[PDB]
Amino acid sequence: VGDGKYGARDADTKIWNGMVGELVYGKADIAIAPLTITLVREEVIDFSKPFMSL
Amino acid sequence: EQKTVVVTTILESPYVMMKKNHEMLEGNERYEGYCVDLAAEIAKHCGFKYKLTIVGDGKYGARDADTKIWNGMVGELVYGKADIAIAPLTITLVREEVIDFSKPFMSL
Amino acid sequence: RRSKIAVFDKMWTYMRSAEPSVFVRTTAEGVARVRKSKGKYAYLLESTMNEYIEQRKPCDTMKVGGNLDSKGYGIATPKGSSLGTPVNLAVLKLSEQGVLDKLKNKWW
Amino acid sequence: QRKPCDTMKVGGNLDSKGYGIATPKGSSLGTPVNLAVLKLSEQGVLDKLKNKWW
C-alpha cells in the first residue's frame, strides 16, 4: 500500500483516500488484506463471501 | 398492474411455526417466528408486498446424482415457481453454481 | 471424514469403531439418547439448535466450549433477479444497526 | 500468544463481521475469485494456515 491506511470517504472532497483508492482509481488489480466490510464500501467495490469470522 | 412476490420457506423451529389459530386466517397471519418477521424488514426496504408459501417436499434441497434434477427450494427457484427464498438454507460451494446468495446474516 | 487434523482423526477413529451403534438418524433420537446415560454420551449438532434446546423445559442440557468451524445462512434469490442488489444491500443495514441482534435476543 | 504471555482473553463476543476479498466492479476476476475462495474453506486449508501462525 502507498500510505498505510485502508481508506475512507474524504470530507466533501468526496475523494477515496487510502488503500481503497488503489482499486477505485484502478491503480491496482486486486486487494488481499484484513479489510472491514460495510455499506460504504459495498456501494463502490464488490466483495466475495467472507473467509474468516471475528 | 402490480405483482406481489411469492415468498417461500420451509417448516423449521422456531424459523417457521403455525400461528395459534392458523385454521381461521388467510394472508400472512397464519404463521409466526423468525423468517416471517425478517421478511417484513426486507420488503419495507425493497418496495413490495408479499405472499407466503411452503415448499412442497419439506426439504432444503439437493441435486440427484442420477437424473441431475434439482429438488427443494433451490430447484423451485431454478424452475421458476417461487420468487424468493427466506430460510435457514446453508451456504455451500455447489449452490453458488445456480443462485447468487448475499452476504450471510448469521454465523454458526 | 475429510479432515487433515490429528485430533479430529483421533476422534473419527473411535467414532467409526465404537460399539454399540454410536450414530443416530434424527435430532429426536439424539436428544432421546443424551438424556439416558446422563453425563456419559456427548452429542454434536448445530450451535443454534444447541442454544435453542437449553431455553426450554426441562432445561437439562447446556452448551460448552466453542465452535470448531464457521458457516452461515443467507438470503437466496433466483439467478439474475433484479432484487439481487437491493436485498443484498439491505441485509447489511439490518446487521449494522443491530436489528438482527434484537430479533435474535427476542426469539432466544 | 506473544511473550511474556501475560495477557488474558475473556470468553465472549459482542457482534459479528468478516474480512474478505475485493475487486473493482465488473472485472473479469469477479466470479472466478469468489468461487475459488469457498473451496479453501471447504478443504480446510484456512484452518491449517491459521494454526501455522496463531
From Swiss-Prot, chain B:
Tissue: Detected in forebrain. Detected in dendrites of neuronal cells. Expressed in the pyramidal cell layers of CA1 and CA3 and in the granule cell layer of the dentate gyrus.
Post-translational events: Palmitoylated. Depalmitoylated upon L-glutamate stimulation. Ubiquitinated by RNF167, leading to its degradation.
Residues binding L-glutamate: 88, 90, 95
UniProt-annotated glycosylation sites, renumbered to this chain: 2
Induction: Down-regulated in the pyramidal cell layer of CA1 in the hippocampus by global ischemia.
Residues at the site labelled Interaction with the cone snail toxin Con-ikot-ikot: 63
Subcellular localization(s) per the UniProt record: Cell membrane; Postsynaptic cell membrane; Postsynaptic density membrane
Domain remarks: The M4 transmembrane segment mediates tetramerization and is required for cell surface expression.
Other noteworthy facts: The postsynaptic actions of L-glutamate are mediated by a variety of receptors that are named according to their selective agonists. This receptor binds AMPA (quisqualate) > L-glutamate > kainate.
Subunit structure: Homotetramer or heterotetramer of pore-forming glutamate receptor subunits. Tetramers may be formed by the dimerization of dimers. May interact with MPP4. Forms a ternary complex with GRIP1 and CSPG4. Interacts with ATAD1 in an ATP-dependent manner. ATAD1-catalyzed ATP hydrolysis disrupts binding to ATAD1 and to GRIP1 and leads to AMPAR complex disassembly. Interacts with GRIP2. Interacts with GRIP1. Interacts with NSF via its C-terminus. Interacts with CACNG2, PICK1 and GRIP2. Interacts with GRIA1 and SYNDIG1. Part of a complex containing GRIA2, NSF and NAPA and/or NAPB.
Family per record: Belongs to the glutamate-gated ion channel (TC 1.A.10.1) family. GRIA2 subfamily.
Name of the protein: Glutamate receptor 2
Species for this entry: Rattus norvegicus
Primary gene name: Gria2
Residues of the full protein shown: 412 to 519 of 883
